[PDB]
Amino acid sequence: IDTCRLPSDRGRCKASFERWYFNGRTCAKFIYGGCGGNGNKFPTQEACMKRCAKA
């Protein structure tokens, strides 16, 4: 699991939506405007846990 290592950006921009991301092993939460994301970013925690907590 090398996707949970990628640093997800919150992308300030003109957006401000709360999303989930991987933090080493556990999940996290912040205001992700939608600018800056690859494989560590995720809308719901269900995917964040199923990608690192379930995998």
- CATH no. for residue 30? 4.10.410.10
Report the distance separating Cα 22 and Cα 53, nearest Å. Answer: 10
Question: Cα–chain-centroid distance for residue 27?
Answer: 8
Angle at 43 between CA 9 and CA 18, to 5 degrees: 65
Distance CA 9, CA 38 (A): 9
CA–CA gap between residue 55 and residue 50 (Å, rounded): 6
Burial class of 41 by CB neighbour count within 10 A (0 to 12, 13 to 18, 19+)? buried
- Cα 23 to Cα 39: distance, rounded to the nearest angstrom: 12
Which residues have C-beta within 8 Å of that of residue 43, sequence separation ≥ 6? 19, 20
Residue range of the domain that includes 28: 1-55
Total domains in the chain come to: 1
